[PDB]
Amino acid sequence: MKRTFQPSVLKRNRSHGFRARMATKNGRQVLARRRAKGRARLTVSK
Amino acid sequence: MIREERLLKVLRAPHVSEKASTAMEKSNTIVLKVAKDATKAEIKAAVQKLFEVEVEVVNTLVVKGKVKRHGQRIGRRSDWKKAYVTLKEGQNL
Amino acid sequence: AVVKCKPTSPGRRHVVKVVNPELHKGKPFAPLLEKNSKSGGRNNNGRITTRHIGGGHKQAYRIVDFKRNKDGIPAVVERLEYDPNRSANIALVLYKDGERRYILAPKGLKAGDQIQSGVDAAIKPGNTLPMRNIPVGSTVHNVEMKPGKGGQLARSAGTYVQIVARDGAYVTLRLRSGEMRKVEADCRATLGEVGNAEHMLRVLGKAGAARWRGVRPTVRGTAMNPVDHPHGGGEGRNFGKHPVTPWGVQTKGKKTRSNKRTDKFIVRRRS
RNA sequence: AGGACCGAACCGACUAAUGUUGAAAAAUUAGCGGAUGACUUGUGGCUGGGGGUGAAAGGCCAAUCAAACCGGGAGAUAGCU
RNA sequence: GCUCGCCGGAAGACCAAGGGUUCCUGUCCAACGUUAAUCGGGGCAGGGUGAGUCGACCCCUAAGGCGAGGCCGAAAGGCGUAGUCGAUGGGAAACAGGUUAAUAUUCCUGUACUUGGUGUUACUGCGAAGGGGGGACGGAGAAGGCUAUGUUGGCCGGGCGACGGUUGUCCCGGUUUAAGCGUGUAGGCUGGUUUUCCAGGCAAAUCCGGAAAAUCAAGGCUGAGGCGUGAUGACGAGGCACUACGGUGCUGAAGCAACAAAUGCCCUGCUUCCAGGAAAAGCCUCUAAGCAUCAGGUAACAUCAAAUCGUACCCCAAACCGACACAGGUGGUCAGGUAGAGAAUACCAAGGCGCUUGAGAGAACUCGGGUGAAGGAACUAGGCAAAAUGGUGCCGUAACUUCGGGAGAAGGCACGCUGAUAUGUAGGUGAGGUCCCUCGCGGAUGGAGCUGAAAUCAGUCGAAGAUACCAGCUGGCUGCAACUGUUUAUUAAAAACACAGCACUGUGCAAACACGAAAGUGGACGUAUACGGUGUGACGCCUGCCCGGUGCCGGAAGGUUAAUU
Numbered sequence A: 001m002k003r004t005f006q007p008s009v010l011k012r013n014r015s016h017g018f019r020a021r022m023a024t025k026n027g028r029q030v031l032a033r034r035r036a037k038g039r040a041r042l043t044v045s046k
Numbered sequence B: 001m002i003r004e005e006r007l008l009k010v011l012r013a014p015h016v017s018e019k020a021s022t023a024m025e026k027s028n029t030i031v032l033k034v035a036k037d038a039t040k041a042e043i044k045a046a047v048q049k050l051f052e053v054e055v056e057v058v059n060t061l062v063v064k065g066k067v068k069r070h071g072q073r074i075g076r077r078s079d080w081k082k083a084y085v086t087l088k089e090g091q092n093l
Numbered sequence C: 001a002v003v004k005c006k007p008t009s010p011g012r013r014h015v016v017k018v019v020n021p022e023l024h025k026g027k028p029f030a031p032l033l034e035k036n037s038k039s040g041g042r043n044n045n046g047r048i049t050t051r052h053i054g055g056g057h058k059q060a061y062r063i064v065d066f067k068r069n070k071d072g073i074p075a076v077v078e079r080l081e082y083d084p085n086r087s088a089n090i091a092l093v094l095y096k097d098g099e100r101r102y103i104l105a106p107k108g109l110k111a112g113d114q115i116q117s118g119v120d121a122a123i124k125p126g127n128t129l130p131m132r133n134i135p136v137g138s139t140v141h142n143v144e145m146k147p148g149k150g151g152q153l154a155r156s157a158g159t160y161v162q163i164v165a166r167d168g169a170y171v172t173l174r175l176r177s178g179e180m181r182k183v184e185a186d187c188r189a190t191l192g193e194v195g196n197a198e199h200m201l202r203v204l205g206k207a208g209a210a211r212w213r214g215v216r217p218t219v220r221g222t223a224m225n226p227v228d229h230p231h232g233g234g235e236g237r238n239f240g241k242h243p244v245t246p247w248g249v250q251t252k253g254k255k256t257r258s259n260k261r262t263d264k265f266i267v268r269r270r271s
Numbered sequence D: 001a002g003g004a005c006c007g008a009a010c011c012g013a014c015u016a017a018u019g020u021u022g023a024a025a026a027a028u029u030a031g032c033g034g035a036u037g038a039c040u041u042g043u044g045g046c047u048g049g050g051g052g053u054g055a056a057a058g059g060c061c062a063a064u065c066a067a068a069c070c071g072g073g074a075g076a077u078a079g080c081u
Numbered sequence E: 001g002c003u004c005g006c007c008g009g010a011a012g013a014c015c016a017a018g019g020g021u022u023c024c025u026g027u028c029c030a031a032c033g034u035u036a037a038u039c040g041g042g043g044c045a046g047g048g049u050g051a052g053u054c055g056a057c058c059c060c061u062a063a064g065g066c067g068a069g070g071c072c073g074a075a076a077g078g079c080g081u082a083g084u085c086g087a088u089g090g091g092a093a094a095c096a097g098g099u100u101a102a103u104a105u106u107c108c109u110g111u112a113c114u115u116g117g118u119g120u121u122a123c124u125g126c127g128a129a130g131g132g133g134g135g136a137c138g139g140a141g142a143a144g145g146c147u148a149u150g151u152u153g154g155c156c157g158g159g160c161g162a163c164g165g166u167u168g169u170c171c172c173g174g175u176u177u178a179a180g181c182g183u184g185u186a187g188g189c190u191g192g193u194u195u196u197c198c199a200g201g202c203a204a205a206u207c208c209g210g211a212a213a214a215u216c217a218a219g220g221c222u223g224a225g226g227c228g229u230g231a232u233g234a235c236g237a238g239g240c241a242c243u244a245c246g247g248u249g250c251u252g253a254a255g256c257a258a259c260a261a262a263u264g265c266c267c268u269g270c271u272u273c274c275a276g277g278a279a280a281a282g283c284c285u286c287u288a289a290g291c292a293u294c295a296g297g298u299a300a301c302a303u304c305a306a307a308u309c310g311u312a313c314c315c316c317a318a319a320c321c322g323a324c325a326c327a328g329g330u331g332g333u334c335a336g337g338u339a340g341a342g343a344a345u346a347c348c349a350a351g352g353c354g355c356u357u358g359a360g361a362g363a364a365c366u367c368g369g370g371u372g373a374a375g376g377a378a379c380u381a382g383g384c385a386a387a388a389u390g391g392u393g394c395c396g397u398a399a400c401u402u403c404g405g406g407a408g409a410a411g412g413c414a415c416g417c418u419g420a421u422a423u424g425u426a427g428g429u430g431a432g433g434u435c436c437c438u439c440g441c442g443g444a445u446g447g448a449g450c451u452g453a454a455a456u457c458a459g460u461c462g463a464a465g466a467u468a469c470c471a472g473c474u475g476g477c478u479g480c481a482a483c484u485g486u487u488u489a490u491u492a493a494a495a496a497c498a499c500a501g502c503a504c505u506g507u508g509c510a511a512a513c514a515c516g517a518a519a520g521u522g523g524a525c526g527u528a529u530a531c532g533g534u535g536u537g538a539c540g541c542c543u544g545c546c547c548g549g550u551g552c553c554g555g556a557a558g559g560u561u562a563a564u565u
């Protein structure tokens, strides 16, 4: 059966990438929260 | 003109392997490790000045580094650049 | 001419089409073509604002001259063409100076016919004049509402406006709806009726034919649940409500016009 | 010519048996419907939660839907166990 | 290694997406692998991805995104102009052969091609952010001409058979060659040329558009394939020769024709239809400002350059999505032989596999199948399931009907093989030869050779000839829904939804209505033969009475009644 995760790198980066997060103030707050938690990976970018 | 500082930085090491040896002794091609940011023109000029050999053409590829495990800890080796430098049929490097 | 189809299949049995052998069979005139993509009834918020819109055949837009501004220069009708953007047919006309335009094709216009616009133009179908120069009692179409704006009324297939009275700076017009409206006398009109009057005699015949025209299915309010529509709900078929729109407004008789800015121009409503 | 006919690909899912700590959190086997169309499919895009979308089943919106998920008010309140 | 079995429109081959070293070699067997493991997609080490032409980057735009100023909004923000991004689409150029353990249109060999920078020569009006052209476009259908490809014959090399026969009308193997360059054919489109003039193309134009004469009758464009060259080459059966027995050195014959033939090409064509079928750049062309014995343009030649990144490997799957080495899911390309209408189905080729526990035994019972006396729905809620039917041609086919249907109604007959007609017919194809020719890829004639249904007559075998696989059960009465469609992903596919049609009602355009504190946007680049809402639901015959209640519409005298004063 067709499962929910159908990978596409371009869609992944356009939806969740660094530049997508920085384009909006709420995405920038996502980055701030993850930096404050100390995540080794801020975004799906790499 | 590429400067000599750049030319002395560009070449890193000779590459040793069965394919490299066969290239040298069949097609007069030396296989070199070069700088990751080195262009074909830079490799040609550097080889021509530092090894004093006339170069026919340069082919390059980027070698992706291997993921390895050291002491049950996961690391990765660096990518490097390999250059196939064909000499002009009488050079003997 | 209206032709009933033979019942060779259930989707064909009830089809009645309008075939016009006088329409151009080739491609439209390219310099007067533009693109127009479909909306799906969606506005710039991405939301559906008009229901039942979507799909249908791709269509290019034909630039049609509603202003009719080349006055003094005669034009010859090069041909009649099908226009997918409207119910009326259009006419490719060539001006004596070498310019080509599209116009709404009035009834009786044929290739080779001559037309002209301006105050000095003759009074015959296809000619465009200010209604101050058009006689009272005339049948006109493509009627301007503001001088120089371009025709806005009586543009559909087979429609026309009747000049009923002239008083001062204003003409009174009878519109297809039955309304009596005041328009400035300096507004232009084109003599005659819009052609293709048999447009209303076609029978689509099947659901797919409506789908071809970009119309999506209408679901009755009673067929829904209460959360979806005021008419929804009921074990079996129940109504017991005053009929309303999906947004709760009475939909059988309740008037919705509220324009005090243009009230003064209406002599009589359509009734 | 045809929302025409029979029938593969392709799309679907009417019956039965199996399976039900499965090979599988919806399938397999044998049959079954559509198969030039209101068809089907790849890539990309848009619509956001009392909101969307719905040929309308309260269906669907990431195995979650008569109001998604995540974090917070929050140790809600619990005459109940 | 030999044998057996399985797939073969796939269970073969090449990719995109996704993964990321899983690729190759050596080495090890703890753990991982549903068993063992010397093996592995496992551990460890080393190796491996070579491009002017393939792809990306790049130029160009779609949907859509963002958006200088700006407009709007308590703030955050929303929208949007100029623009700028954004492929799933448009835009230059490379092929064949050889080679590695592992890359190859990338390396080597041979033979090419494109675009640009210079410089020499010759000629010369160049010039854009502007104008025009072009790019540039649908569905269905029909046919011709071809090719890929296949079959047979010919040819070359070899063979003479474990058991009757096999020097022949016998058997086996091979019978391949590209891009490019030249030529310009089947087909398709279009009348050409010169002269004068002009309210159009945001200005100009010699370009496009329009008008008016003369003149000639063929001029142009496009275009598969073929042919020649590329190629005295390459490849090539085999033969000879090494092995550290996994692979490699030398040498090399023939390499043709006929027939069949696409879903590929001519074809972005042609015919027809309505539901009327992107954009922009590259490209061609025209001028403006302007440059103006400069620049620049065209042509030729020589020279230089063409960067960067990807390239291993899997890719219907043990490497992707499914927690698994999981009977699931996953877009594109290719399409051999016999039979067959076929990409169905059966059996095979090339290629790939036997699905990572085995070995016995031959109880009940479960699962998946085969057969079955006599009966034949008696079973059961119910013929559920099973059994049965099943092809082509021909004959023949009822009520009813909206005249299309019903209909494949129902039912019935023929069907293998051999010979004759005719040692291969009708048809299709068509060599040499022969004549003519606005002379070549021409025409007419002629039929050799090749291919090749179908019918009739005669005979013949079997229980059975549509023999396997494959492949409708049929008829009658009645409810519902007109019909094709849609739906509860995962217990409901239906009489439910939709539907064409009908009706009522709103709406005069800054439309009603909808999304939006707004600006705006959709409706619609539409304009009452239009658009929205509501109910009903093809079609036929029809749709009666009630306005008291609730709603809606109209009225505005009178009574009552807000802020205000």
Ligand SMILES: NC[C@@H]1CC[C@@H](N)[C@@H](O[C@H]2[C@H](O)[C@@H](O[C@H]3O[C@H](CO)[C@@H](O)[C@H](N)[C@H]3O)[C@H](N)C[C@@H]2N)O1
Pocket: E152, E153, E173
């Ligand atoms: N399994 C056996 C293989 C299978 C493949 C099949 N195509 C054939 O292939 C052979 C093929 O038949 C042979 O052609 C011969 O025979 C043909 C007629 O039969 C003739 O047209 C031809 N002129 C003649 O030379 C060829 N020499 C070798 C091929 N391997 O036999």
Ligand SMILES: NC[C@@H]1CC[C@@H](N)[C@@H](O[C@H]2[C@H](O)[C@@H](O[C@H]3O[C@H](CO)[C@@H](O)[C@H](N)[C@H]3O)[C@H](N)C[C@@H]2N)O1
Pocket: none
């Ligand atoms: N004019 C007379 C027509 C002639 C054509 C014929 N096909 C039939 O058509 C009818 C058709 O049979 C009817 O189906 C019935 O019978 C089927 C089989 O027994 C059942 O599966 C079905 N449940 C049952 O309803 C149908 N209801 C209406 C059709 N008009 O009678």
Ligand SMILES: [Mg+2]
Pocket: B057, B059
């Ligand atoms: Mg090279």
Ligand SMILES: [Mg+2]
Pocket: B060, B061, E051
């Ligand atoms: Mg490279």
Ligand SMILES: [Mg+2]
Pocket: C051, C052, C218
């Ligand atoms: Mg509607």
Ligand SMILES: [Mg+2]
Pocket: C217, C218, C219
């Ligand atoms: Mg409706």
Ligand SMILES: [Mg+2]
Pocket: C218
């Ligand atoms: Mg309706």
Ligand SMILES: [Mg+2]
Pocket: C218, C219, C220, C221, E534
């Ligand atoms: Mg409705």
Ligand SMILES: [Mg+2]
Pocket: C219, C220, C221, C229, C246
């Ligand atoms: Mg509704």
Ligand SMILES: [Mg+2]
Pocket: C223, C224, C225
């Ligand atoms: Mg319901």
Ligand SMILES: [Mg+2]
Pocket: C226, C229, C230
């Ligand atoms: Mg309600």
Ligand SMILES: [Mg+2]
Pocket: C235, C236, C237, C238
């Ligand atoms: Mg009820």
Ligand SMILES: [Mg+2]
Pocket: C234, C237, C238, C239, C240
């Ligand atoms: Mg009720």
Ligand SMILES: [Mg+2]
Pocket: D004
């Ligand atoms: Mg059909």
Ligand SMILES: [Mg+2]
Pocket: none
């Ligand atoms: Mg479904």
Ligand SMILES: [Mg+2]
Pocket: none
């Ligand atoms: Mg099935």
